[PDB]
Write a protein that binds this ligand. Structure first.
Ligand SMILES: [Ca+2]
Ligand SMILES: [Ca+2]
Length: 291
DNA sequence: GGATGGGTACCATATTGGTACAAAGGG
DNA sequence: CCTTTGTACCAATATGGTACCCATCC
């Protein structure tokens, strides 16, 4: 069964803690939701997660994407137990803390709809304001004088367990095989990207794997990547590491194919014509080219 | 009446992930 | 000379997010 730190690592990568407000004829409803949305080829892994959470919530599917949503207050309590015991470490931790606060207010009040004059409602709107994309312009018109709450700082966070990294990479990792345009040479890369708001966390990856380096992703500097390329490191640190703490979902297959190329390179087979042919074949069917 | 659940449409960008080469750097 | 590595480039979409509407429950 799926390890709990894997579930957390995967949520730091792809999950969401949201509170939304809707008007319902002179009353506002507070709608909490926890959400994971993936491309449809990973429905299977969503099923394993939903399962981990006592089959709370529901999956929905639309030809290209699939979505796990947990929206009822009963169901949400068990989600919150998990993340209290196995804490997030990305900036997503802060949206989770704010989320948790609102949930507690709703439980204290035993209900989800409020008349504009409610004090609890204003406290909630104040907190909602510092979450995710903040207030809508519609709500902003109806509550002009609300001061957003303090967004908690998330600093100096350590990777709590290797299984977190397996979850996280199952979410944001990428395994590549580079061929030269001249078609002579082959190399590998393992990359993880993130928004610049988590540059600190990503720089500590160099320490975790004990190799690789850290770059900006584009001229904007609004995103950064962790990268390993050096083949000694890939073959001695990165691959053994993930043979033990296994990645999951379709990305597992890309990791298997990547591993296969890596063995051919170990044995020098990448400098043979057939070896290069086999590697090109493997490459043409991995990642976004996968059947 | 009113409240909640849940399916599904819709929005925006942080990833998703492909390419490329010059400068190491070895024997 | 020859092959690996660090770094760069960047288009677009798989993600992270939000809204609306109604059937059914109290
Ligand atoms: Ca993410
Ligand atoms: Ca992903």
């Amino acid at each position: 069964s799926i390890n709990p730190w894997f579930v957390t690592g995967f949520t730091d990568a792809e999950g969401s803690f949201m509170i939304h407000l809707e008007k319902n004829k002179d009353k506002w409803r507070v709608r909490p939701t926890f959400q994971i949305k993936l491309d449809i080829r990973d429905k299977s892994l969503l099923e394993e997660i939903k399962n981990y959470f006592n089959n709370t919530g529901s999956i929905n599917t639309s030809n290209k994407e699939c979505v796990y949503k947990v929206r009822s207050l009963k169901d949400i309590s068990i989600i919150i137990s998990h993340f209290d015991k196995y804490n997030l470490i990305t900036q997503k931790k802060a949206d989770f803390e704010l989320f948790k606060k609102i949930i507690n207010k709703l439980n204290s009040q035993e209900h989800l709809s409020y008349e504009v004059g409610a004090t609890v409602l204003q406290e909630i709107i104040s907190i909602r304001a510092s979450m995710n994309l903040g207030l809508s312009s519609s709500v902003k018109e109806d509550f002009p004088h609300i001061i957003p709450s303090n967004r908690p700082l998330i600093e100096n966070m350590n990777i709590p367990h290797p299984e977190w990294m397996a979850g996280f990479v199952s979410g944001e990792g990428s395994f590549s095989v580079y061929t030269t345009s001249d078609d002579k040479y082959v190399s590998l890369s393992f990359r993880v990207s993130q928004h610049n708001k988590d540059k600190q966390l990503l720089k500590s990856f160099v320490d975790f794997f004990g190799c690789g380096g850290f770059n900006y992703h584009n001229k904007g500097n609004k995103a950064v990547i962790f990268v390993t390329r050096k083949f000694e490191d890939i073959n001695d640190k990165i691959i053994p590491l993930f043979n033990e703490y296994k990645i999951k979902g379709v990305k597992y297959k890309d990791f298997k194919d990547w591993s296969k190329v890596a063995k051919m390179i170990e044995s020098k087979s990448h400098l043979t014509t057939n070896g290069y042919k086999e590697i090109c074949k493997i490459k043409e069917n991995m990642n976004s080219y996968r059947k």
